């Protein structure tokens, strides 16, 4: 939110822990909400 990227597809992020241990981490953030307007449009059946 510091750079105003509140709405975005993906978000790679990079940083390294401080102090005596110095180790780098790679991050990815997202929040998908795959949706569809009308469920009745599709018909799902299980064959047997």
């Amino acid at each position: 939110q510091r750079e105003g990227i509140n709405a975005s597809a993906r978000y790679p992020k990079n940083w390294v822990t401080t102090g005596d241990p110095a180790r780098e981490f790679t991050m990815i953030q997202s929040a998908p909400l795959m949706l569809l307007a009308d469920p009745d449009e599709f018909v799902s059946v299980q064959l047997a």
Partner: protein
């Protein structure tokens, strides 16, 4: 026969890691999509959530 520097190894491994994370994002997106338009009762569950 042709060694590489540790920093070159760093760039290789980080590129591989970001590719893997992108693949994981694609996996979860596809899973949500198939659950959604396969039942419409699409759960969203998991530990630490």
């Amino acid at each position: 026969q042709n060694l590489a520097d540790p920093a070159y190894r760093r760039r290789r491994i980080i590129m591989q890691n970001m590719r893997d994370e992108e693949l994981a994002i694609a996996q979860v997106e596809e899973m949500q999509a198939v659950s959604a338009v396969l039942k419409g009762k699409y759960t969203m569950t998991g530990e630490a959530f």
